[PDB]
Design an enzyme around this catalytic site. Structure first.
Site, mmCIF file in Angstrom:
data_model
loop_
_atom_site.group_PDB
_atom_site.id
_atom_site.type_symbol
_atom_site.label_atom_id
_atom_site.label_comp_id
_atom_site.label_asym_id
_atom_site.label_seq_id
_atom_site.Cartn_x
_atom_site.Cartn_y
_atom_site.Cartn_z
ATOM 1 C CG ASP A 41 -13.679 14.101 -0.481
ATOM 2 O OD1 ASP A 41 -13.450 14.019 -1.701
ATOM 3 O OD2 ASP A 41 -12.826 14.477 0.351
ATOM 4 C CE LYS A 86 -16.133 7.301 -4.014
ATOM 5 N NZ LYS A 86 -14.639 7.305 -4.252
ATOM 6 N N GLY A 123 -7.999 5.812 -4.090
ATOM 7 C CA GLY A 123 -8.044 6.337 -2.741
ATOM 8 C C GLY A 123 -8.934 5.536 -1.806
ATOM 9 C CG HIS A 124 -10.781 1.437 -0.425
ATOM 10 N ND1 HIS A 124 -10.305 0.672 0.624
ATOM 11 C CD2 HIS A 124 -12.104 1.157 -0.520
ATOM 12 C CE1 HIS A 124 -11.292 -0.043 1.133
ATOM 13 N NE2 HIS A 124 -12.395 0.232 0.456
ATOM 14 C CD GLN A 184 -11.053 10.574 -10.159
ATOM 15 O OE1 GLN A 184 -10.640 10.137 -11.238
ATOM 16 N NE2 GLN A 184 -10.924 11.849 -9.805
#
Ligand code: GCP
Ligand code: GCP
EC number: 6.3.4.4
Lengths: 431, 431
Positions: free
Chosen positions: A13, A16, A40-41, A224
């Site tokens: 979180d 990035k 997660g982008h 991550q």
């Protein structure tokens, strides 16, 4: 430099996504080197909102090339979903993406092992929650898994699957008492996509050295956070892979020495999810604030995300694990309209000692109490600011201590969730 | 440099022992970063000759600290037997040795897994697997194993152990049809070495960060040869861990940017133990000549090691995977007395294309034909030669050609096992 590493320095979180797309304008090649489908982008293309988890961030760029390397565990199943997406949204993904032969493959039986594990072992504790990233990694180590390479020789591919599939099916049904996985279906499934993968295959560490030989700009993206690194992190509350800069040589096949610059992303305050040590968490109101003002909720059944002050003692740990070159401080805006800001500068142990180094993942973190250094706040709005001339004296004063304390400077400052909301004091690629 | 990394550029057995002993006279710190009780290093412990498999030869020195970094799998049973061994000899092992807490533990059930896995997945003709190194790494990555740090909470080892062991006896007895390892025994044996193992634990990452900041000579050492790398090696035929230089950031806790000089030990020729591609293997007299004079016997039930000329195509991969700084050529003297000599310079692919890069384990090694350069040899023995000048022009041509085909300077040459029989042209430390 030309070989730049980007990654978060906390527990995730860090925000990035913005800097990434930002650096992806001056870089020719982009490489994922560790982990799996949990990058997660989030992005936007066809006027619709899409989230990538596998494909690197540069796929949008026309004259960029995105590579998935040896360090990433692959899942055809998840690659075809993301491609199909962008293809529909009009993106030449096949002419823009390349994968390693050495990529380990995740297949349904690998998700099954995981699904069956937590349920059993304990559906409330950290087993592993579905996508079989761990089993893919474990099969690899043990030298029984499969790679993209294997897909070239179909005859052999079919036989090996059966050898692996039986060992797993045995332990599924016999140990876990779970329904087994039909080898014929996994077979049908992978063959249907074989030639696609095989066609994107390339000699990555060669192309990378070749890229270095000629001065092309390369950016390595970690997915991550550092403090969750399987080895060096706050164990046992860790993730399946290594999440630090050192995994880059292993992950792509480039030498240690060609790592020129390492950008560590940095949120102005901290957040953690799920249990695990968190020395500066806030329990009542400022805690609420730092959440309400920063969008600290959910994002994937995330019941709630904990918050607390910037812990310099752990950031320092990250500085050393990555040999960080410089920072990228995010969300300083959330701090506006605040009476003051504290920075943690050391711990107090349960035995009464005062220590400036992260305690071994063998000493009670639950015991450590943070020695805070308090600093005056700022009511001015930093949100949007596109130069430092508009940053207040107090804002610049908070920066310097983080710099004085960590022993690494801040080259990029972010002032909002939008591209324009950024201050590039240095830029990794010219340094 | 100042942070030196030393390792095999071929398939192991390059002749590292002598070089390492030599450098440890200059090093203030010695660090193991990957592996287990493989090491294998004959130390003539002041009179008595001993074979150390885990402790660094740097333990015999009055001013060097030896560290077992976290990338090495730890066997208490094994290290105690080596402690008393040296402690009997008069060496204060217990006060120059430091273990990281992140080091996975190797224990009874890991070896008895190894020993069953061999039976079934092996056959009569020396099954040399029984160690437990593969297994332990399989447990680590699957956040299911124990570490040295765990020993710091006696009540918790007790429970985490019964669990990981529950899972293992199910395999041992129901899948492998082998027997079960008794739990109270393993709990009991381990507890009796606990306070000893936890009395040597230290925060490795900081210690190293201190010495580097402070400028001390730290040496790192690889145990297995480069092309055996779990990742960029000949897949089937590769070990359980990462042998290259990149394993440095990961197994010690010191980011990538702080490795200074990466010294790769090259053998005047190549040898191979076991299955796998060896495109320059010799099946004629010259092979027998090389094996004979090189003493390439496995120093125990040593089924003759495979032999052949040196392979610049293979050697170049090594250079590329570790960003090699310079070479250290060994056993050059084994070639004394050979009318002429060859080296592989390219590989001929079945469709004719001659190439300078190894087949990406996929579009196979088995099919490759080697392309050589036959240069005259020497007669005049080079054993013990102490100066560059005292080498024949044929032996000198040879060195310079390796240098050309590869593009890395041979900075150290060995001309005999004793230590005075060495030529230092650059010296890694003050470079
Ligand atoms: N207010 C504020 N929001 C920011 C800033 N930089 C980014 N954001 C926002 O905060 C969120 C940051 O997370 P994101 O950009 O998704 O990256 P990430 O969270 O590190 C990636 P993952 O969580 O999957 O590892 C985004 O929703 C973004 O719009 C900033 O400087 N201030
Ligand atoms: N004639 C000759 N013998 C040498 C030379 N250098 C070393 N030796 C012999 O080399 C042999 C191999 O050395 P050693 O250092 O034990 O093994 P290693 O290559 O480090 C390790 P591994 O086998 O684990 O890859 C030793 O038994 C030593 O006696 C040399 O230049 N010339």
């Amino acid at each position: 430099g030309n070989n730049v590493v980007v990654l978060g320095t906390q527990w995730g979180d860090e925000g990035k996504g913005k800097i990434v797309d930002l650096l992806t304008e001056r870089a020719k090649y982009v490489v994922r080197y560790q982990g799996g489908h949990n990058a997660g982008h989030t992005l936007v293309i066809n006027g619709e909102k899409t989230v990538l988890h596998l494909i690197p961030s540069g796929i949008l760029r026309e004259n960029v090339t995105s590579i998935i390397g040896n360090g990433v565990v692959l899942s055809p199943a998840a690659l075809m979903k993301e491609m199909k997406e962008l293809e529909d949204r009009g993106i030449p993904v096949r002419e823009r993406l390349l994968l390693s032969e050495a990529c380990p493959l995740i297949l349904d039986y690998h998700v099954a092992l995981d699904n069956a594990r937590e349920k059993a072992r304990g559906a409330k504790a950290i087993g592993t929650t579905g996508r079989g990233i761990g089993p893919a990694y474990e099969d690899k180590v043990a030298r029984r898994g499969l790679r993209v390479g294997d897909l070239f020789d179909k005859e052999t591919f079919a036989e090996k699957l059966k050898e692996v599939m039986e060992y797993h099916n045995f332990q599924l049904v016999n140990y876990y008492k779970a329904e087994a996985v039909d080898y014929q279906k996994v077979l049908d499934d992978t063959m249907a996509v074989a030639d696609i993968l095989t066609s994107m295959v390339v000699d990555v560490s060669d192309l990378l050295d070749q890229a270095r030989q000629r001065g092309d700009f390369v950016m390595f993206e970690g997915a991550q956070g550092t403090l969750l690194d399987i080895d060096h992190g706050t164990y046992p509350y860790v993730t399946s892979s290594n999440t630090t800069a050192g995994g880059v040589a292993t992950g792509s096949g480039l030498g240690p020495r060609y790592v020129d610059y390492v950008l560590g992303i940095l949120k102005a305050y901290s957040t953690r999810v799920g249990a695990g040590p968190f020395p500066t968490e806030l329990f009542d109101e400022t805690g609420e604030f730092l959440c309400k003002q920063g969008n600290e909720f959910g994002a994937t059944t995330g019941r709630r995300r904990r918050t607390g002050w910037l812990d310099t003692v752990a950031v320092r740990r990250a500085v050393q694990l990555n040999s960080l070159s410089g920072f990228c401080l995010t969300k300083l805006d959330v701090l506006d309209g605040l009476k003051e800001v504290k920075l943690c500068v050391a711990y107090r142990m349960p035995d009464g000692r005062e220590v400036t180094t992260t305690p071994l993942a063998a000493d009670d973190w639950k015991g450590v109490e943070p020695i805070y250094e308090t600093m005056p706040g700022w009511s001015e709005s930093t949100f949007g600011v596109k130069d430092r001339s508009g940053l207040p004296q107090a804002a610049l004063n908070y920066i310097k201590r983080i710099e004085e304390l960590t022993g690494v400077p801040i080259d990029i400052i972010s002032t909002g969730p939008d591209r324009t909301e950024t201050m590039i004091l240095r830029d990794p690629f010219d340094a």
